Amino acid sequence: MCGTEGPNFYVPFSNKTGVVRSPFEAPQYYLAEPWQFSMLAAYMFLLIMLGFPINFLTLYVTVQHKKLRTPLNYILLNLAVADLFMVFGGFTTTLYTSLHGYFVFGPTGCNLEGFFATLGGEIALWSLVVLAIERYVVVCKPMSNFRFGENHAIMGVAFTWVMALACAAPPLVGWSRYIPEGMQCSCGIDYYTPHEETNNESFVIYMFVVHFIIPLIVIFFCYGQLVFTVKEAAAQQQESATTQKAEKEVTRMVIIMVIAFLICWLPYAGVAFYIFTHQGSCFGPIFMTIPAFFAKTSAVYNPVIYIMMNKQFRNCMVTTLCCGKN
Numbered sequence: 001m002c003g004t005e006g007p008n009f010y011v012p013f014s015n016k017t018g019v020v021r022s023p024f025e026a027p028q029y030y031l032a033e034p035w036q037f038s039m040l041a042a043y044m045f046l047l048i049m050l051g052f053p054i055n056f057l058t059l060y061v062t063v064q065h066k067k068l069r070t071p072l073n074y075i076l077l078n079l080a081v082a083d084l085f086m087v088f089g090g091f092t093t094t095l096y097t098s099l100h101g102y103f104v105f106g107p108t109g110c111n112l113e114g115f116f117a118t119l120g121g122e123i124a125l126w127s128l129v130v131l132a133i134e135r136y137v138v139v140c141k142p143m144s145n146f147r148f149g150e151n152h153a154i155m156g157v158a159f160t161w162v163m164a165l166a167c168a169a170p171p172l173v174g175w176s177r178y179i180p181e182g183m184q185c186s187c188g189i190d191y192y193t194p195h196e197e198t199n200n201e202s203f204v205i206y207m208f209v210v211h212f213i214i215p216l217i218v219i220f221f222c223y224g225q226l227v228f229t230v231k232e233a234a235a236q237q238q239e240s241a242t243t244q245k246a247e248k249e250v251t252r253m254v255i256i257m258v259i260a261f262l263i264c265w266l267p268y269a270g271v272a273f274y275i276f277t278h279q280g281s282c283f284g285p286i287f288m289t290i291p292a293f294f295a296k297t298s299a300v301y302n303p304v305i306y307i308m309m310n311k312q313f314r315n316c317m318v319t320t321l322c323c324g325k326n
């Protein structure tokens with residue numbers, strides 16, 4: 001063999017030895033070293049012990065603090081919730097699994113895991129588009145001034161959850177399916193079987209075009225455009241350089257949250273994709289394990305970039321923790 005096609009799983013390990021068990025019945029210790037399986041669980045623990053407060057803290061600095069009612073404060077408060085859903089939904093279940101070297105919870109567990117991660121990535125990807133749009137509408141202003149009401153922010157934040165669920169939910173109902181990846185301690189969209197009863201190949205190419213391409217294409221159109229008013233339509237469009245200061249600061253962060261995304265997220269699809277097309281070309285259980293567990297930091301770093309490149313915020317953040325003020 002290459003790997004071992006099951007009813008609800010696929011493995012990158014030869015059943016020519018017979019040795020292949022199922023990731024819903026007993027240990028996959030036969031995949032790497034039972035020292036290595038601990039490494040997942042160890043990694044997962046820090047990310048659980050990291051995301052919880054650094055995402056809890058921001059989801060509260062804001063709910064508490066007043067002045068913090070700007071369109072960015074919302075989206076970074078939208079990741080603030082999205083991330084804790086990864087952690088208490090995905091991560092707890094994903095970790096607990098790696099100690100066992102296989103899912104104990106049945107596929108009924110590999111749903112949360114896969115789901116609540118797909119989910120978090122998609123709220124991230126979309127929270128960027130609405131962030132990108134915002135920057136376009138704000139920096140190189142189009143026409144007049146229905147300039148964002150706290151309203152338009154809602155319509156945006158609610159926007160992400162919608163779009164982001166139009167990707168994660170379907171595989172859950174059986175437009176696709178959450179299935180164990182790599183070392184079988186992470187679950188992600190069935191790129192493996194051609195399995196027919198879920199029209200697999202459709203959903204997978206669905207999920208790319210509209211939850212990858214398009215999302216990016218919008219992002220990218222706005223990307224460059226974020227260098228037009230940082231110059232001449234600023235030297236000409238007379239905006240007090242007190243605003244070409246705080247606003248040219250928001251643009252850096254956003255720009256960096258993008259890079260951040262593509263640094264973190266791109267390697268996963270590097271494989272996810274390769275798999276889909278070179279389906280059944282032999283490969284190991286570390287091929288898709290690294291990108292998965294790595295890209296899984298998506299539930300940690302955005303609130304931090306935020307403490308690191310947003311001064312007003314950071315100062316409320318210390319006000320909170322230090323009681324009264326700094």
Ligand SMILES: *C/C=C(C)/C=C\C=C(C)\C=C\C1=C(C)CCCC1(C)C
Nearest residue numbers: 117118121122186187188189269292
């Ligand atoms: C650790 C396990 C995870 C993150 C499980 C599943 C992830 C996906 C199905 C990824 C979806 C995608 C995202 C979130 C962003 C880039 C496009 C994508 C389809 C690879």
Ligand SMILES: *[C@@H]1O[C@H](CO)[C@@H](O)[C@H](O)[C@H]1NC(C)=O
Nearest residue numbers: 004006015018019020021022
């Ligand atoms: C092949 O793998 C299957 C399914 O995991 C398993 O049930 C079977 O015992 C293995 N092969 C043999 C020859 O028994």
